[PDB]
């Protein structure tokens, strides 16, 4: 799809058998999802945003289907106010900015 | 241009006669620039990110040239760690996400 930006570029993702809406976020290096039951091991990590940081759980090699594109990558889980699909996954679905 | 996302989608902007690099940021509603001398009036505003909430100065109807596209819009100025071009301006240059 081509997505204009008059609205937040939200997409429906499937991860860990759960459906979520997430923001395609070109300003996000990484993918950060709200608290969710993911299976498996993790590593503590911190991400920085506007104003603050947040501690997150880093899960490697997690399957995610982003708007019907299955990808597998690192997913951060923590107290983010939005599910964010970062460049780490957007590259895997071949997502470009165009103007 | 078409911009893939293997790197941060940085563009060179011109604003207030100054050249800056800025991130084309689809996860940003608004445009937030680092502290910079802008001429004119402003209103105090707050933006929220990952972790925190920063006070910013809201400037309306500011001319910006983003990668050779002149647009005019609201620019927020404050202690952001990156110049961020948000959807408010990306729409004005016709920027889409595509995959
Ligand atoms: C999700 C994060 C991993 C992401 N950060 C990164 O990718 C960073 C660079 N990577 C990173 O952390 O690498 C690890 C690291 C880095 C340095 C040292 C050690 C380790 C991020 O927060 N990035 C943000 C900007 C940024 C850039 C560089 C450095 C730090 C921060 C936006 O690009 C990103 O798009 C977020 C996405 C987002 C959406 C929704 C909620 C939270 C975050 N937007 C924002 O933070 C924007 N805020 C908003 O748009 C909010 C949602 N609206 C808002 O507040 O509107 C006014 C309002 C007022 C009152 C009520 C409601 C709204 C902001 C840039 C304008």
Q: A1-99 sits in which CATH class?
A: mainly beta
Q: How far apart are CA A56 and CA B30, in angstroms?
A: 25
Q: How far apart are CA B9 and CA A27, in angstroms?
A: 8
How does strand A2-3 pair with strand B96-98? antiparallel
B14-18 — which CB contacts under 8 Å span 24+ positions?
B14/B64, B14/B65, B15/B62, B15/B63, B15/B64, B15/B65, B15/B75, B16/B62
Pull the structure tokens for residue B30.
């608004």
**H/E element, A88:** helix A87-93
Show the beta-strand stretches assigned E in A1-99: 2-3, 10-15, 18-24, 32-33, 43-48, 53-66, 69-77, 84-85, 96-98
Query: Which residue among A48, A53, A55, A57 has the greatest number of ligand 1 atoms within 8 angstroms of its CB, and so is best to mutate?
Result: A48
Q: How far apart are CA B25 and CA A73, in angstroms?
A: 21
Resolution to 1 decimal place, in Å:
1.8
Q: How far apart are CA A87 and CA A93, in angstroms?
A: 10
The domains of chain A are located at: 1-99
DSSP-based three-state secondary structure for B93: helix
* Contact predicate A66/A11, CB 8 Å: yes
Between the CA of residue B69 and those of A11, A86, B4, B15, what are the distances in Å? Answer: 28, 25, 19, 12
Q: Which residue has the CA at smallest separation from atom 28 of ligand 1?
A: B82
DSSP-based three-state secondary structure for B89: helix
Q: How far apart are CA A34 and CA A68, in angstroms?
A: 20
For chain A, list residues whose CB is within 8 angstroms of any CB belonging to chain B.
1-6, 8-9, 23-29, 32, 47-54, 67, 69, 80-82, 84, 87, 90-91, 93-99
Q: Where are the alpha helices (DSSP H) in chain B?
A: 87-90
Pull the structure tokens for residue B47.
């933006």
């Amino acid at each position: 799809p081509q997505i204009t930006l008059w609205k937040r570029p939200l997409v429906t993702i499937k991860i860990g058998g759960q459906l979520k809406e997430a923001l395609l976020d070109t300003g996000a290096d990484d993918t950060v999802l709200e608290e969710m039951a993911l299976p498996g091991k993790w590593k503590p990590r911190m991400i920085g945003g506007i104003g603050g940081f947040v501690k997150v759980r880093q899960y490697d090699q997690i399957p995610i289907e982003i708007c019907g594109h299955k990808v597998i990558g690192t997913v951060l889980v923590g107290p983010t106010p939005a599910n964010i699909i970062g460049r780490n996954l957007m590259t895997q679905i071949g997502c470009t900015l165009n103007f």
